[PDB]
Amino acid sequence: ASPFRLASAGEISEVQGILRTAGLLGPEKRIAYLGVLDPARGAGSEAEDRRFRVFIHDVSGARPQEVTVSVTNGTVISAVELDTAATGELPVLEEEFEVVEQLLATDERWLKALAARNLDVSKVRVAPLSAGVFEYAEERGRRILRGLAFVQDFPEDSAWAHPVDGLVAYVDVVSKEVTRVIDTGVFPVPAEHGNYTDPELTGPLRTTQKPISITQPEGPSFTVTGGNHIEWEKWSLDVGFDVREGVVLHNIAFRDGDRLRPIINRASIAEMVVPYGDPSPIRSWQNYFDTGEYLVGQYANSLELGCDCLGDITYLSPVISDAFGNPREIRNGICMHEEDWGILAKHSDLWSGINYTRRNRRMVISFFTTIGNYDYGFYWYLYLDGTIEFEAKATGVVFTSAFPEGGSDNISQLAPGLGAPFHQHIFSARLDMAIDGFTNRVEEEDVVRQTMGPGNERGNAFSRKRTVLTRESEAVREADARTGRTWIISNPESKNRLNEPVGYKLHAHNQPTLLADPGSSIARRAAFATKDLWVTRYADDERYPTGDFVNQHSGGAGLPSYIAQDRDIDGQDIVVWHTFGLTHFPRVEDWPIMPVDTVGFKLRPEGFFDRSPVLDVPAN
Amino acid sequence: ASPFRLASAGEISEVQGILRTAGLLGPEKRIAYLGVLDPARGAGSEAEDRRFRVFIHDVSGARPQEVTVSVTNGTVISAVELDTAATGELPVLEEEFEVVEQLLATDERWLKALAARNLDVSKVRVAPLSAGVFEYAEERGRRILRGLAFVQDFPEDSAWAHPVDGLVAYVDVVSKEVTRVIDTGVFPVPAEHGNYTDPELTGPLRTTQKPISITQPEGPSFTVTGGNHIEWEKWSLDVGFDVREGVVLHNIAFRDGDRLRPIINRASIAEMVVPYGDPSPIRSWQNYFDTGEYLVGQYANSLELGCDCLGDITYLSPVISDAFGNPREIRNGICMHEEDWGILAKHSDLWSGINYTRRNRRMVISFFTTIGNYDYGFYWYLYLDGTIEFEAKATGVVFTSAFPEGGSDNISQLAPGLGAPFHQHIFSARLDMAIDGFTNRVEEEDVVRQTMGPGNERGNAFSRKRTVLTRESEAVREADARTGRTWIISNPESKNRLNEPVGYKLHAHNQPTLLADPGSSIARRAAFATKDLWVTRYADDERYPTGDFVNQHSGGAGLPSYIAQDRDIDGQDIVVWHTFGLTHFPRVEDWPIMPVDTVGFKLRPEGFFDRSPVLDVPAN
Ligand SMILES: [Cu+2]
Ligand SMILES: [Cu+2]
Ligand code: NA
Ligand code: NA
Ligand SMILES: [Xe]
Ligand SMILES: [Xe]
Ligand SMILES: [Xe]
Ligand SMILES: [Xe]
Ligand SMILES: [Xe]
Ligand SMILES: [Xe]
Ligand SMILES: [Xe]
Ligand SMILES: [Xe]
Ligand SMILES: [Xe]
Ligand SMILES: [Xe]
Ligand SMILES: [Xe]
Ligand SMILES: [Xe]
Ligand SMILES: [Xe]
Ligand SMILES: [Xe]
Secondary structure (H helix, E strand, O other), X not given: OOOOOOOOHHHHHHHHHHHHHOOOOOOOEEEEXXXXXXXXXXXXXXXXXXXXXXXXXXXXXXXXXXXXXXXXXXXXXXXXXXXXXXXXXXXXXXXXXXXXXXXHOOOHHHHXXXXXXXXXXXXXXXXXXXXXXXXXXXXXXXXXXXXXXXXXXXXXXXXXXXXXXXXXXXXXXXXXXXXXXXXXXXXXOOOOOOOOOOHHHHOOOXXXXXXXXXXXXXXXXXXXXXXXXXXXXXXEEEEXXXXXXXXXXXXXXXXXXXXXXXXXXXXXXXXXXXXXXXXXXOOOOOEEEHHHHHOHHHHEOOOOEOOOEOOOOEEEOOEEEOOOOOEEEOOOOEEEEEEEEEEEEEEEOOOOOOEEEEEEEXXXXXXXXEEOOEEEEEEEEEEOOOOEEEEEEEXXXXXXXXXXXXXXXXXXXXXXXEEEEOEEEEEEEEEEEOOOOXXXXXXXXXXXXXXXXXXXXXXXXXXXXXXXXXXXXHOEEOOOHHXXXXXXXXXXXXXXXXXXXXXXXXXXXXXXXXXXXXXXHHHHHOHHHHOOEEEEEOXXXXXXXXXXXXXXXXXXXXXXXXXXXXXXXXXEOEEEEEEEEEEEOOOHHHOOOEEEEEEEEEXXXXXXXXXXXXXXXXXX | OOOOOOOOHHHHHHHHHHHHHOOOOOOOXXXXXXXXXXXXXOOOOOOOOOEEEEEEEEOOOOOOEEEEEEOOOOEEEEEEEOOHHHHOOOOOOHHHOOHHHHHHXXXXXXXXXXXXXXXXXXXXXXXXXXXXXXXXXXXXXXXXXXXXXXXXXXXXXXXXHOEEEEEEEEEEOOOOEEEEEEEOOOOOOOOOOOOOOOHHHHOOOOOOOOOOEEEOOOOOOOEEEOOOEEEEOOEEEEEEEEOOOEEEEEEEEEEEOOXXXXXXXXXXXXXXXXXXXXXXXXXXXXXXEHHHHHOHHHXXXXXXXXXXXXXXOEEEOOEEEOOOOOEEEOOXXXXXXXXXXXEEEEEEOOOOOOEEEEEEEEEEEEEEEEEOOEEEEEEEEEEOOOOEEEEEEEEEOOOOEEOOOOOOOOEEEEEOOEEEEOEEEEEEEEEEEOOOOOOEEEEEEEEEEOOOEOOEOOOOOEEEEEEEEOEHHHOEEOOOHHHOOEEEEEEXXXXXXXXXXXXXXXXXXXXXXXXXXXXXXXXXXXXXXXXXXXXXXXXXXXXXXXXXXXXXOOOOOOHHHHHOOOOEOOOEOEEEEEEXXXXXXXXXXXXOOEEEEEEEEEEEEOOOOOOOOOOOOOOO
């Protein structure tokens, strides 16, 4: 009954049937994206209309379509032909991944390059990589992937150990033609294997780890109703899943006494980009928008119990469309569990004689995805004390190259002859705020140092200042760790018992933002990544910081275009877009498989409550 | 047999006996500090000499002494009379805490102040607070505490809810005289109670939290031998305890194949300061050096199982001296346990067909202390992957004041009429480094942006730079979060298999440092707190960033004096001192008892190992 419920297999089959009936899904058509649309603002009192958005590709070369379907009513709402040279190519199809290697295997230029390096074509894997937009005019309006080669010595070998540097190829995956093969010269293909399950490399496995058993004999403290509505320790929300964004949180609210108080209307990772910092022409075009180009949700892992998620786990198994419109379940794709989180509050008071200790917990909602060599975990946390946090966990196998004789300013050495190009992993969290409702504003808060003098004779005073961001033109902000800069989202019409507007404070990690030159292609396509915080006025069609079609799409869409409207954001329905990322100079310890590294952000209540919200937590 | 073993009750009793026999511990003498000294550099092949350092106070007004005793040989090594006006007062004695209230209760000025506010003297608690060094010339050479008043309505009432603003008193705790009583005017004493165990305030306790059971059916994976030597998942160290610093880690090393490789020789929190930012004369002198003035180890809590430390816990019960030299055990004062830490490494490879997941764990060594209203947890973590981390957890009850009519730039409102002055909690971690041995150096590493142009035509390149800190004069460094600044400690004579010096990288949180005006008393006494990183050449007498005697001691000692020596630190025995802290603008959610907030730092291996050190971790 909830309009925020997960898409069911039946709904996807029905979208398929509606499209077929309407003449929009014949044998040459493929679904490159399909997702449920969120309900419009208002229309809660109105009857429900489940609508799905679909991007339809055509393998015969005809123009793709953007389509909206009402599965409730069995109708096509809208259908429009896309001009991809203008608005962008559709996301990469899973079926196109294999096409790069297959086509290159019978290309005379590719074969000549491999023969020069004494490499057997049957052993050469080709990573199918997004192309971006550079100086190649013939690529405009065409679906291109670029291929980098890695040798696989045998079926179970890790090809990443054996990059073939000095070689790159470009392929049109629709017309099935190799457009270009660039060979800048032979590099030695690194010879050491990177097989992290081979006993020769691991040595004898440790026998020293005794078991840790985490159980809940009475079950978990959270409830799941309507498939995806969670209630836990005063929190409530709906766990959505989208093939592009992955896990999406809807209607995050907190029950304070009798009142259900909204905090965040929608929380998602709306984009992530991995720009590479190696100026070699073999990789200088390399920027993976895993969300926008590849769709991270579609590659979500099935998570095994006791391995990926430990404890008393409740799973969701979201359904997505395959390329033909048939439903496909991602079995155990979302993990949900609560875990202990150390001490919540503690005081031993001399005067009263009262000793007091309470323990903390957090609700965890997560998924893990695999994009080629990369594996990312996306974790949302809700804490007893009102804190909301996101954490990304990056692991997998690092993307490799040759390590140049005489070293490199842009590549790390991992093993003899084996390099790892420098890169970043940068995320954009889109937080459609609803602090006590939709009438919100954002202030930038800095610490203020004070000069010793009149009114401050001992030179000890310090303070802070808040600046309201009143319009979108002044709401593109950078970090300032030195001055403890944070951003507070408040509701100017909702006051706490001390007559102060209720609010939440966003605490960033203040990691470096996009490092590329501001005149680069990537600085334009990932403009969002150049600044730490953006605030926009809510609009239903402003979904991603990079726009709807990122693949082979220049600047022109996304956040810079949204804020040009210069809309009022002082006590309005607003959206915060926070950029945060890891800058990775790979270390030898990252090879042959990388230990997890993390980045994230959190929001803490700031006069939202009238006192601590965890006074009613019981002892022990 | 280990020279790093915890002090035993017998050793402390023996120090007492040696001092007594030597004529240094008569009836008027009190021990203000006692701790074991670490073994000297070298002397490992030599027979052991357990030496203790003692600060002896005299209640009759005679000059205190600094004494070194050999408990092994039953001798006094050295004994010197201290001139406290020059070198500093001894740490506050626990017995002096109560003296402030007791003396004030019969003082006519104090009684007049309380009568003006209609407060019953029997209900007025006085916080005994360190005095610092300000403009009062008669305090020089005298042991002074300052008192701030809080009303306790009944025995179990939280006095912190009822601050008596506009009033402060100064007391000589040796001569037992009230030197000054300052009354700047009456403020309303806030009336609401802050009793967080009163059902009227908590409401009905939650019944929604189902149990979480964490057990280890085969016991823990770590071993404890010789009382305090820990071995866990290739790590080894000795867990010390000092009454000043609290838990100290010695000989942190990692067993890589057959070789035990040192990483850190000694790790401690060598100081912590809590400066207040309220310019009111009632509190503008307020700066608590909890480590240096109060001795945090001495107030370590006894930690209850299932409440303070959850899981399979192994406790240490460190012994300290009381004021007369008798041993006193802090029962269950140190917690040791291992815990699961999510995914360690994960990759699902298309080409090889191999799916791989490993789980992480960390060893946790912790204690919790209480200083008046404040409670701090100190946590050290060792991870499977070689990462070392420290985390401080701050909780307790916030220090309160009146909230001024018409607001304040330096105080937050918590409840009607109730204020919380702005302040910081700033820590100094002293890391006596031993990366593969004692020959170490530090480099500052910054990200380097590159300009689009020749050699970087697409404007994607980025790099980094390292600057060796060669001498102490150039080793006082600040954070730069924007450029991803870190510091690498390496051994220039120990190379990994890729011919690069082995190293560890320190990752700071880049929180603001000391905010006080540089000309203030606190900026001089806590000079260490004004900069993020210091590197010194190791010396046995350079123990604390504030020197040996912090109480009522001006600038002149500590880190600024150490680095003036301008010693070679490029491939030498060096010590890193990292400043890190929380800047606290109290929120309503902090009242009436504050949810934990955290700050810390970590160090990660940086080409220390020849490949990932966790390839031998078993599945599941
Ligand atoms: Cu990376
Ligand atoms: Cu604080
Ligand atoms: Na909003
Ligand atoms: Na050292
Ligand atoms: Xe079109
Ligand atoms: Xe929840
Ligand atoms: Xe879907
Ligand atoms: Xe579909
Ligand atoms: Xe791949
Ligand atoms: Xe969550
Ligand atoms: Xe990450
Ligand atoms: Xe003296
Ligand atoms: Xe350990
Ligand atoms: Xe001790
Ligand atoms: Xe003693
Ligand atoms: Xe106290
Ligand atoms: Xe530890
Ligand atoms: Xe803290």
